[PDB]
Design a protein around this ligand. Structure first.
Ligand SMILES: [Br-]
Ligand SMILES: [Br-]
Length: 108
């Protein structure tokens, strides 16, 4: 399917969200690990295409969550709005699956 991983720096006082469109009845899996900065803790957020929260966790160093998906835009976020001063270095890995033919599907 799609195995994808990145490591990015998140300034203090900032929340950053990422959008991931999905087929219907695919399977999104996300995993994160805070690597550096502060108490190595982050707030993690995962909302449905409808705006419904599917995952919310405060001050975590790591987490894993998997979904059976609807068809829409899923957004996951990493929140460091609580830290004054200390930045955070976050690693996350997105794994898409169960998706079965053009550039339309490819670009979105
Ligand atoms: Br798609
Ligand atoms: Br934890």
């Amino acid at each position: 399917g799609s195995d994808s991983d990145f490591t990015f720096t998140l300034p203090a006082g900032r929340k950053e969200c990422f959008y991931q469109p999905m087929p219907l009845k695919a399977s999104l899996e996300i995993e994160y690990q805070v690597l550096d900065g502060g108490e190595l803790d982050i707030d993690f957020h995962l909302t449905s295409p409808e705006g419904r929260t599917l995952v919310f966790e405060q001050r975590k160093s790591d987490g894993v969550h998997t979904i059976e998906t609807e068809d829409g835009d899923y957004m996951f976020c990493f929140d460091n709005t609580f830290s004054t001063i200390s930045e955070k270095v976050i690693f996350f890995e997105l794994i898409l699956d169960n998706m079965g033919q053009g550039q339309e599907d490819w670009k979105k």
